[PDB]
Structure 1
Amino acid sequence: DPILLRPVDDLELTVRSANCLKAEAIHYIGDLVQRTEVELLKTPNLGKKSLTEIKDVLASRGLSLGMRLENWP
């Protein structure tokens, strides 16, 4: 797969959600989508709009929540 190894900075994320995800210590898109809705929503200063826009960019990049990973990284 050539799309899972791209850095999470490619997602064009705002600063607040970027800081929240850095606190979650996520740097790969597969690691970004390994978790779920509530698990990422529990983080402080991250609202429904942040994860909503994350899902929007994932859908615009041909991804949809509910997948799983195998042998990564």
Structure 2
Amino acid sequence: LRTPNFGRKSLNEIKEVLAGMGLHLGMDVPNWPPENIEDL
């Protein structure tokens, strides 16, 4: 919500599509693979 044009209806669809992919809010270390070592 602290971003310009924070889509109220799109924030729910994006969370739904993220949960459908297998990921959710948090559930991991904060920026674990933040380097280029995780690039495939």
TM-score by length of 2: 0.54
CA shift in 2, pair 1:44/1:58, >3 Å: same
Of 41, 48, 60, which aligns to 2:20? 60
Give the deviation of 1:47 after TM superposition: 2.3
* Residue equivalent to 1:48: 8
- Specify every segment of 5 or more residues in structure 1 that has no aligned partner in the other structure, as ranges: 1-40
- Specify every segment of 5 or more residues in structure 2 that has no aligned partner in the other structure, as ranges: 36-40
Indicate the percent of aligned positions where both proteins have the same amino acid: 58
**Count of residue correspondences:** 33
Distance 1:72 1:65 in 2: 17
TM-score by length of 1: 0.36
Higher relative contact order (CA 8 A, sep 6+): 1
* Residue equivalent to 1:20: none
Q: Helix, strand or coil: the match of 2:9?
A: helix
Q: Which residue identity lines up with residue 28 of structure 2 in the other structure?
A: R
Distance 1:59 1:71 in 2: 20
Aligned Cα RMSD in Å?
1.7
Moved over 6 A (4+): none
